[PDB]
Design a protein around this ligand. Structure first.
Ligand code: SF4
Ligand code: FCO
Ligand SMILES: [Fe+3]
Ligand code: NI
Lengths: 170, 250, 306, 164, 604, 532
């Protein structure tokens, strides 16, 4: 009674094409461009892990702003409603939520001019459940099944080995 | 150069010689009942400046404490600094500091003056009044209220004592957080609080949702008798939507 | 006789900053505010006397010497003013020309201090100080002159005695010269709408902008004493009936009480006038000052007619 | 004079502050009070602060998250109270906030971090994990009633368990 | 006797002029000779004046140099004291004035001016007074900077002799004599006509500078040397007043309108000179207009005296004719102070414009103090020597006000009102002059590199300022010594002024705020002179310094018709040959022909 | 679609010059024209079509279409709509023809795009540095997206000011009277150079942008959409809610966000509460500058009633913090309705007594009548806004010409005068107090019901519109481009006195130094609004 994308480890080669394809379709839409499926590699096989779109959905239980609902059999997190409280990343038992925020638009990472002393560097990244940069509002980033896109999930379409497919159990 | 700079040419705060700075206690004693204040707007948004004007108002009257706003820095005992010190306002602020009799009391007024405020890291400012001149008194607020300005002036002149103090890390830090409204379902409380913020805003929504769920924990007759006491139609509108949310949850 | 005139000079200097306190209290009451006490100006002068006197680098001894010169000039005027007696304490300084040219000394020194600092605001305020002094002298001299003509003498003692033993037949020239001298007293006290030199909100109170510390304190004290001696020239000559013709120790207390009440009522009426309007400009002031010269000329014509 | 009637008709409008307090509205946005017990170190308020009055620093050496509120930075907008999940931070009606030392502006907290069960790297505030565990226990959860070590695991290590 | 003293003075002046002309190949030696001889001749002239004023009787005699009849009345002894006390320090100034590379020898011109002036004072015949006044006027117009600045002086100064020669011919025809003693006896039955008096007053005011016959005065003073300009303002313009007072007081019988005309003309001269000075930036043109203001005050005194003679009121005669003459002598003193000090500032800087002359008070401090004394003396601020004669003229104005004659009662308060206006304008002008010259920052590099004045310059200016302070403070004693010239008691109307009480009270009374600042000075940090003036936090530019142009714009607005009267009443386009190319040069050539033939015929 | 007839007239006059046109709102049209026909198009829409130049600005769109973009927003006021004239400027050669030789209102944004963007308006008569300070380094343009980091603070190139001032009507024989940056009347820093002949202003130049902090760079680097609402509250502490509302209804206008009807009227009410304190601040300072310090005290005593209303309605006295994108953050329960209704009726009887003691002030008529005259055709050419142009006879007002928030449902009356002097600019502001009290009294009696915000919406990237609020000193035009779901791409703010300052020179000519603080105060200057 839920819709999600699952990966096959015996078919996946760990090329990270799906991570780039998921990043591009959300960057064009203005959403968070962090990849919502992450490729994990034991030394023997590999498969990207993403949101299971659970029936009980413990992330939606602990959300203090009700940003996480169920739409069309899919657990959907409202990115504009999230207040970055990061409770959903603890409650998720599958590690499907990490935390990234939008950086300034079309401004390079090293934008320092030689005409001034350089800007203070960013703090060292420990964990997205703990990091905070003053210009960056790191909100919860999970798979939304590319529901804005008419072609469906971009990770499934751009997988060369067809290791990803949707499980439409509705 | 009007102000001191570092090896990179970036301006640094002006020090005050120890012989001159050892007289600030005596100046603070003798300006208790007669204080002359020169306002130095170093690049604020005018919010701080016009609550100083409202501290000269008939309602909030600062002259009864012996505080007179002076036309020139030459007359000043207290130099009142507002603003994040913009680049075009560094040199006039230092000129007002230098064309004033020594010793001088510096009151940093407002968040912008205290640390830069909301512009604490911008390119065309310096980040507060302590980045150019030493500061005796910090008055926070964006802008401070004229009551806060009166309190800061009276605390600088020694008529009143400082009330707030720093809170360091202690042991409450590890005493665990309590669940809000633990006698009810927490996603329902989230939905009720979000619906009450939609209709009433964050400030009234939290007050209305907390009161409504407190009355709902006792009974529906308890909610209805609470609405009769308030006798506000807008609150009846909001509690009707909250009841609709509670009924949709059931 | 070398003590009455100096005792009067010491008494007026010491109280001059209390009449400024009535002025600043009545200003606060007309601003609908509680305001400070009557000793705020003294509290402000004593604080400034222990404050460092600074100045511009392009200034010399004139800038440092002017406040003490103006205080000494006002003390010199105050020894010759009838306060508790009808006659002057020092009648050889009591000529109206003498007391008019003594005031010109302090306006000259005020104007050269504003040209010594090099500021545009101080120099423009010096320029207004001297120009208001230009504009007000015809009316003040013609009023005092008409009173001296109705008194047979330019001495302030004899003018005060003639207003005291008021003549009645020469009532119209005396009343019109009194109105001219009252208006002249209001302009010479630098009171709004004629505060064209120390015009904060324009010149950062003019030549006072460069003064600091003890120099600013002695300047504020000289301004207060100048206002006191101008108002005392009016109210101790044209309202002399609380004074006494011969000095007695028994009648001294009532004379000081009536002199203090006259000064307080004068600064209260003056406060009611200055806190109730906008200040003028220097290009429109001559029409109003020529109109006071008019009250004085009407006085002068009413002496020629009769 | 119309000005003199106006002055006489008004009277004295000056209050007696500081002798008698000056009333501010029940919902006046004064100083943000902060309950350190109710705070879970979630930095939701830190992410919503426009003037960066709220800062967190991850101090690995002390194994803690350094929560801090700076009153000299605060623009008194109330967004911390708006986005707070536990309602730990709230704007009071206090306005008498002037200091002599700007260190007195600081409201500091230090919450112990939680090391991951698998990689022993500090990944989250232990207080926030305890609050999430209590929240799931309140809604009826067995993963919270029996398995706290799954909540004290980092999301990368929780993604490694799904690989098998 | 005083006749031998004045003969020695005339001989020393003539020998000084001759040996200054012959030894003019070395300018320093010529200046030393001219200054020493002029100082000795001025000492003899002042000694003769003091002798005649102390003896309280006129002396008679003749000069041994040429056949020149001499009467020295006590009235003319004040002019002798004036001339000697000016020319002594003017010549001692001239000694170090001849050390400048850009100046020329002038001691022949200066000492011939002094000799002709002294012989005009001690003149017996009115025709001879008109001869020595023109010898002085030619020796004065040759002291100008160039031919362009003495063209109007040659035109007006000879016009005034054509009128004086017509008046003297008319006196010869009506009385058969020009001796002043004989004319005084012959006009106790037949009075002096008003046509003769009008011609003489217009001709002498063309030399004394009565406005509007004053047109040569600022041109003449504009770029002349400092001893020359000081002698113009203190000697040459005072001989015309001597002629006016001589002609007005012959017969002791004056018409009423003579004194009335003198008072109006004096009021016109005083107010117009004091107002026109406040619109000048050349210091010497300003001091020329201020010489005109003081000439107007001396006539307000002399006209009050003549009006009292006409109304037979001896108190008015005494007050007017003592205040005017005391103001005349003390004006000469402080006008000499100001012209010599401004010339010292020009000596050290090269500038007569005070807009290019900032901050001289720190570079020339002794000169700055003496100039301050002179400028306060000219504003008639007590207890200096300008207030001493002006206070007495106000007492004469009060005597005019309480008279029976309706014209005296009408003019009396009005002349006092005008004198108050003139004094306030004077205070404004001296505030401007001391502020933009000796105060503030320097405005040119010449004002920065000014050093102290030379020794005899400083001695002359300081000694003249000391004489100004003496004539101010000791005025209650020096004023009754003029009762020899006017044998009448001085009666102010139930009032008195004591300048020593004002002197002691303007120094002791400022010590009291100093005493209280020294008591209430707890830990006040010492005084600071650190930076620029406060211009609201911006950088202080040179254009933020308000100068003499912007200080006196309100008097250009509030006295617009009087300042515009200088352009409507000017008959410069109505004279046909005035705008010719070589008119000033031809005026100069026939000036030396007239001076040459006059010197040739007067030795005969 | 409003402005179709204007687009047809533009295509009829200059065939082919319009390349691309699009509608962002039903009353907002943006046309893309050829770069070298830009001064003819803006002059055509300015004089032939009777438009008013609201804001002109640059946009670093080199990563969108490879070109710098200069927008030229024209307010059609002969229904009324907006026309934005857009050109594409080459990135390698940032040169475009200047509109200032044809439209005199174009002098300052063309000076601003030199400073913030480095574009070169060819033919601009005044190339003086305007927005950047004197110690800012050359060829360092902060609003370019790759030129510099927003946290970088360069070393000052100088400590003394290097700005050059223009004295047209005078000579070097004039003195200068520096009013500001730290004058008594300088409530906020602004330096005014009075080229005087004594006490008569021959000509007047001025240096501003002392208060410039770099706010438009902060809005696209460290701030999110909802954080600029509090940043816009700090553009100017006097009209901060005007900036807050103009920013909020430009993101919402770009996205088509349907704000609830209750939030729009409370936005319209608090824009009038902000108007109440600002006009009494100006009227009190107008009394203050003439020496009438009692009128300064009287007007600031009544101003505290509106500050009490602002504290009741918003929770703060001045910096309201009311607007979020999609709605407002506070409701009005009855103690809020009851107290503010009492205070608004208290304010009306109490302002009326102050106007009587202001028009009967003994020297207020000779200080204000005929002083600081703004010539009406000078005000048309430079596109002056608000009470300063409404006193000059041009009855233009945003709340009426371009209706926004809940102003279509409020009793609006446009107040204009015909005398062009200090007193009439006060008389516009006096009459606007009574109209603001009328809309507050009606608004507090006729509030709609329903929610206060919408939320959960997503921002579509690279969407833009105009945001306009009528600030107390005239129109406040904001232009926001959405960058992604969290951050903006470009936020331009143009305040009222930015359109009103360039005619201060003609207003200060022929007056006195004692009149000069009053003439500046009559412009009702908001320096922090101008500088940002
Ligand atoms: S602290 Fe706030 S109100 Fe004060 S100047 Fe800064 S931004 Fe404006
Ligand atoms: N009012 C206001 Fe502020 C300005 N100028 C805006 O917009
Ligand atoms: Fe881990
Ligand atoms: Ni503003």
């Amino acid at each position: 009674m839920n819709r999600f994308v699952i990966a096959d480890s015996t078919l996946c080669i760990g090329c990270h094409t799906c991570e780039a394809a998921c990043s591009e379709t959300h960057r064009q839409h203005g959403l968070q461009s962090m990849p919502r499926l992450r490729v994990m590699l034991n030394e023997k096989e590999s498969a990207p892990q993403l949101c299971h779109h659970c029936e009980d959905a413990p992330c939606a239980v602990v959300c203090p702003v009700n940003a996480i609902t169920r739409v069309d059999g899919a657990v959907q997190l409202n990115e504009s409603l999230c207040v970055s409280c990061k409770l959903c990343g603890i409650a998720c038992p599958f590690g499907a939520i990490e935390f990234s925020g939008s950086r300034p638009l079309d401004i390079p990472a090293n934008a320092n001019t030689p005409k001034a002393p350089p800007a203070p560097p960013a703090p060292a990244r420990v964990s997205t459940l703990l990091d905070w940069v003053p210009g960056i509002r790191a909100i919860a980033v999970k798979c939304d099944l590319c529901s804005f896109d008419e072609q469906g999930p971009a990770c499934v379409r751009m997988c060369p080995t067809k290791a990803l497919h949707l499980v439409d159990n509705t | 150069l009007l102000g001191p700079r570092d090896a990179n040419g970036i301006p640094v705060p002006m020090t005050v010689d120890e012989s001159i700075a050892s007289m600030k206690a005596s100046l603070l004693k003798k300006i208790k009942r007669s204080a002359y204040v020169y306002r130095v707007d170093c690049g604020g948004c005018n919010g701080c400046e016009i609550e100083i004007f409202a501290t000269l108002s008939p309602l909030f009257d600062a002259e009864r404490f012996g505080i007179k706003v002076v036309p020139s820095p030459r007359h000043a005992d207290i130099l009142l600094f507002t603003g994040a010190v913009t680049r075009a306002m560094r040199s006039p602020a230092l000129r007002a500091w230098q064309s004033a009799p020594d010793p001088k009391i510096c009151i940093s007024y407002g968040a912008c003056g205290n640390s830069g405020g909301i512009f604490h890291d911008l390119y065309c400012v310096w980040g507060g009044t302590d980045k150019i001149v030493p500061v005796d008194v910090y008055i926070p607020g964006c802008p401070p209220t004229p009551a806060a300005t009166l309190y800061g002036f009276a605390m600088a002149l020694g008529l009143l004592e400082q009330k707030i103090h720093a809170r360091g890390p202690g042991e409450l830090d590890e005493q665990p957080a309590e669940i809000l409204h633990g006698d009810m379902v927490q996603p329902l409380r989230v939905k009720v609080d979000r619906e009450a913020r939609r209709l009433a805003g964050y400030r009234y929504g939290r007050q209305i949702a907390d009161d409504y769920l407190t009355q709902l924990g006792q009974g529906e007759e308890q909610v209805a008798r609470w609405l009769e006491a308030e006798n506000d139609p807008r609150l009846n509108e909001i509690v009707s939507h909250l009841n609709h949310v509670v009924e949709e949850a059931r | 006789s070398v003590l009455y005139p100096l005792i009067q000079a010491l008494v007026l200097f010491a109280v001059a900053p209390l009449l400024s306190g009535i002025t600043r209290v009545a200003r606060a009451r007309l601003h609908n505010r509680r305001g400070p006490g009557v000793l705020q100006e003294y509290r402000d002068i004593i604080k400034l006397l222990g404050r460092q006197s600074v100045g511009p680098d392009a200034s010399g001894w004139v800038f440092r010497l002017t406040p003490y010169v103006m205080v000494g000039v006002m003390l010199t005027i105050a020894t010759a003013l009838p306060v508790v007696t009808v006659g002057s304490p020092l009648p050889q300084l009591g000529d109206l020309i003498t007391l008019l040219y003594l005031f010109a000394i302090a306006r000259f020194f005020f104007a050269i201090s504003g040209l010594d600092t090099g500021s545009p605001f101080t120099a423009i305020g010096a320029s207004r100080e001297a120009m208001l002094g230009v504009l007000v002298e015809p009316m003040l001299l013609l009023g005092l002159w008409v009173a001296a003509q109705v008194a047979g003498s330019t001495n302030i003692s004899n003018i005060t005695d003639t207003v005291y033993h008021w003549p009645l037949s020469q009532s119209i020239p005396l009343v019109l010269a009194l109105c001219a001298c009252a208006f002249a007293t209001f302009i010479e006290m630098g009171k709004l709408p004629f505060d064209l030199a120390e015009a904060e909100q324009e010149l950062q109170e003019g030549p006072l902008s460069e003064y600091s510390g003890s120099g600013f304190g002695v300047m504020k004290w000289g301004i207060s004493l100048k206002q006191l001696v101008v108002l005392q020239m009016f109210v101790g000559v044209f309202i002399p009936w609380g004074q006494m013709e011969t000095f007695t120790a028994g009648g001294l207390l009532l004379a000081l009480v009536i002199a203090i009440v006259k000064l307080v009522v004068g600064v209260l009426v003056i406060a009611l006038f200055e806190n109730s309007m906008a200040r003028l400009r220097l290009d429109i002031t001559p029409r109003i000052t020529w109109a006071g010269f008019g009250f004085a000329f009407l006085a002068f014509v009413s002496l020629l007619a009769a | 004079f119309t000005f003199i009637k106006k002055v006489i008709k008004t009277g004295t409008a000056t209050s007696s502050y500081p002798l008698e307090p000056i009333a501010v509205d029940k919902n006046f946005r004064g100083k943000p009070e902060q309950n350190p017990q109710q705070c879970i170190g979630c930095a939701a308020c830190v992410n919503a602060c426009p003037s960066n009055a709220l800062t967190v620093e991850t101090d690995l050496a002390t194994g803690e998250l350094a929560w801090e509120f700076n009153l000299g930075h605060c623009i008194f907008c109330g967004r911390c109270e708006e986005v707070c999940p536990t309602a730990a931070i709230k704007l009071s009606q206090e306005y008498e906030l002037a200091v002599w030392k700007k260190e007195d502006f600081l409201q500091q907290s230090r919450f112990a971090l939680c090391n991951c069960r698998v990689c022993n790297r500090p990944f989250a505030v232990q207080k926030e994990i305890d609050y999430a565990i209590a929240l799931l226990k309140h809604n009826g959860d067995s993963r919270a009633e029996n398995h706290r070590e799954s909540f004290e695991t980092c999301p990368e290590c929780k993604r490694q368990k799904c690989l098998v | 006797s005083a006749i031998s003293l004045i003969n020695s003075g005339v001989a020393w002046f003539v020998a000084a002029a001759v040996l200054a002309f012959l030894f003019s190949f070395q300018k320093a030696l010529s200046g030393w000779i001219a200054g020493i001889g002029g100082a000795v001749g001025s000492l003899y002239t002042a000694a003769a004046g003091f002798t005649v004023l102390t003896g309280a009787v006129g002396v008679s005699g003749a000069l041994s140099l040429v056949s020149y009849d001499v009467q020295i009345s006590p009235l003319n002894a004040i002019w002798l004291i004036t001339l000697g006390l000016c020319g002594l320090f003017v010549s001692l100034y001239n000694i170090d004035w001849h050390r400048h590379a850009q100046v020329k020898c002038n001691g022949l011109q200066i000492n011939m001016l002094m000799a002709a002036a002294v012989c005009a004072v001690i003149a017996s015949n009115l025709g001879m007074f008109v001869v020595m006044a023109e010898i002085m006027a030619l020796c004065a117009v040759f002291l100008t900077s160039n031919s362009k600045e003495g063209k109007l002086w040659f035109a007006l100064g000879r016009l005034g002799t054509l009128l004086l020669a017509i008046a003297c011919w008319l006196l010869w025809q009506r009385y058969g004599t020009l001796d002043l003693r004989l004319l005084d006896m012959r006009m106790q039955q037949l009075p002096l006509g008003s046509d003769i008096w009008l011609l003489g007053v217009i001709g002498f005011g063309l030399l004394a500078g009565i406005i509007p016959l004053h047109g040569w005065v600022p041109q003449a003073h504009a770029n002349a040397s400092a001893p020359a300009a000081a002698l113009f303002s203190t000697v040459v313009m005072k001989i015309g007043l001597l002629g006016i007072l001589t002609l007005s007081l012959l017969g002791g019988n004056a018409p009423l309108w003579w004194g009335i005309a003198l008072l109006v003309l004096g009021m016109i001269t005083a107010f117009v000179g004091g107002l026109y000075a406040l619109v000048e930036h050349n210091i010497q043109r300003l001091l020329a207009y201020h010489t005109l203001e003081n000439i107007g005050i001396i006539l307000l005194g002399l006209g009050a005296g003549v009006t009292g003679i006409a109304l037979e009121q001896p108190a008015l005669i005494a007050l007017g004719l003592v205040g005017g003459l005391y103001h005349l002598l003390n004006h000469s003193l402080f006008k000499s102070v100001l012209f010599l000090g401004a010339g010292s500032v020009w000596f050290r800087t090269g500038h007569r414009d005070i807009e290019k002359l900032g901050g001289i008070g720190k570079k020339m401090p002794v000169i700055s103090i003496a100039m301050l004394v002179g400028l306060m003396a000219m504003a008639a601020l007590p207890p200096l020597n300008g207030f001493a004669g002006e206070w007495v003229i106000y007492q004469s104005f009060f005597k005019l006000s309480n008279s029976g004659a309706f014209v005296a009662r009408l003019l009396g308060p009005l002349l006092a009102v005008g004198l108050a206006i003139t004094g306030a304008l004077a205070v404004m002008c001296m505030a401007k002059v001391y502020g933009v010259t000796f105060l503030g920052a320097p405005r040119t590099k010449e004002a920065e590199n000014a050093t102290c004045a030379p020794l005899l310059m400083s001695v002359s200016v300081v000694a003249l300022a000391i004489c100004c302070v003496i004539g101010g403070v000791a005025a209650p004693w020096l004023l009754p010594m003029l009762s020899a010239a006017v044998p009448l008691p001085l009666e102010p109307a139930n009032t008195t002024v004591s300048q020593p009480m004002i002197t002691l009270l303007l120094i002791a009374c400022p010590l009291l705020p100093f005493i209280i600042m020294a008591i209430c000075k707890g830990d006040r940090l010492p005084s600071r002179s650190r930076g620029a003036a406060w211009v609201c936090g911006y950088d202080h530019e040179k254009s933020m310094v308000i100068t003499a142009h912007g200080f006196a714009m309100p008097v250009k607005q509030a006295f617009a018709p009087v300042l515009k009267l200088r352009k409507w009443l000017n008959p410069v386009s109505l004279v046909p040959g005035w705008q010719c190319e070589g008119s000033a040069l031809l005026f100069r050539r026939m000036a030396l022909v007239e001076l040459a033939v006059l010197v040739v015929i007067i030795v005969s | 679609k409003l402005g179709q007839h204007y687009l047809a007239a533009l295509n009829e006059a200059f065939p082919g010059v319009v390349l691309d046109h699009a509608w962002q709102t039903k009353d907002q049209l943006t046309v893309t024209v050829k770069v070298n026909y830009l001064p003819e198009v803006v002059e055509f829409l300015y004089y032939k079509q009777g438009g008013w130049l609201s804001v002109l600005f640059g946009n670093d769109e080199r990563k969108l279409n490879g070109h710098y973009a200069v927008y030229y927003v024209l307010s059609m006021e002969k229904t009324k709509c907006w026309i934005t004239v857009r050109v594409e400027v080459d990135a390698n050669k940032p040169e475009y023809p200047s509109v200032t030789p044809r439209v005199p209102a174009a002098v300052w944004g063309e000076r601003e795009v030199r400073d913030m963007y480095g574009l070169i308006p060819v033919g601009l008569p005044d190339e003086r540095r305007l927005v950047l300070p004197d110690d800012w380094p050359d060829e360092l343009y902060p609003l370019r997206k790759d030129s510099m980091d927003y946290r970088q603070r360069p070393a000052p190139t100088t400590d003394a000011e290097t700005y050059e001032f223009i004295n047209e009507l005078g000579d070097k024989k004039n003195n200068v009277v520096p009013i500001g940056p730290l004058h008594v009347t300088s409530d906020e820093p602004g330096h005014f150079r009075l080229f005087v002949d004594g006490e008569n202003i021959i000509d007047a130049d001025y240096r501003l942008f002392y208060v410039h902090r770099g706010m438009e760079k902060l809005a696209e680097t460290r701030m999110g959409y909802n954080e600029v609402t509090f940043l816009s509250d700090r553009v100017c502490g006097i009209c901060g809610f005007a900036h807050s509302t103009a920013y909020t209804t430009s993101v919402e206008n770009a996205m088509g966000i349907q704000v609830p009807e209750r939030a729009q009227m409370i936005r319209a009410i608090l824009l009038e509460v902000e108007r109440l304190h600002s006009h009494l601040l100006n009227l009190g300072l107008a009394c203050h500058f003439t020496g009438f310090d009692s009128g300064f005290m009287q007007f600031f005593r009544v101003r505290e009633t509106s500050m009490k209303m602002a504290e009741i309605l918003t929770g703060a006295r001045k910096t309201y913090g009311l607007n979020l994108i999609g709605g407002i953050r506070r409701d009005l329960l009855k103690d809020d309705m009851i107290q503010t209704r009492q205070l608004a009726q208290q304010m009306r009887r109490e302002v009326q007594e102050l106007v009587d003691v202001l028009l009967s002030t003994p020297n207020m008529e000779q200080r204000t009548v005929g002083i600081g005259r703004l010539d009406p055709e000078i005000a048309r050419d430079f596109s002056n806004v608000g009470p300063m142009v409404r006193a000059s006879g041009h009855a233009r007002d945003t709340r009426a010409d371009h209706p926004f928030v809940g102003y279509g449902l409020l009793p609006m009356e446009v107040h204009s005068e015909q005398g062009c002097d200090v007193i009439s600019r006060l008389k516009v502001r006096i009459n606007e107090v009574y109209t603001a009290l009328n809309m507050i009294d009606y608004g507090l009696d006729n509030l709609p019901g329903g929610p206060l915000m919408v939320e959960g919406f997503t921002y579509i990237p690279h969407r833009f519109a105009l945001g306009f609020a009528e600030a107390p000193r005239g129109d406040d035009i904001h232009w926001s481009m959405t960058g992604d779901n969290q951050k903006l791409y470009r936020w331009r703010c143009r305040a009222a006195t930015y359109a009103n300052w360039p005619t201060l020179r003609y207003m200060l000519r022929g007056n006195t130094v004692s009149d000069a603080p009053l003439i500046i105060g009559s412009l009702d200057p908001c320096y922090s609004c101008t500088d940002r």
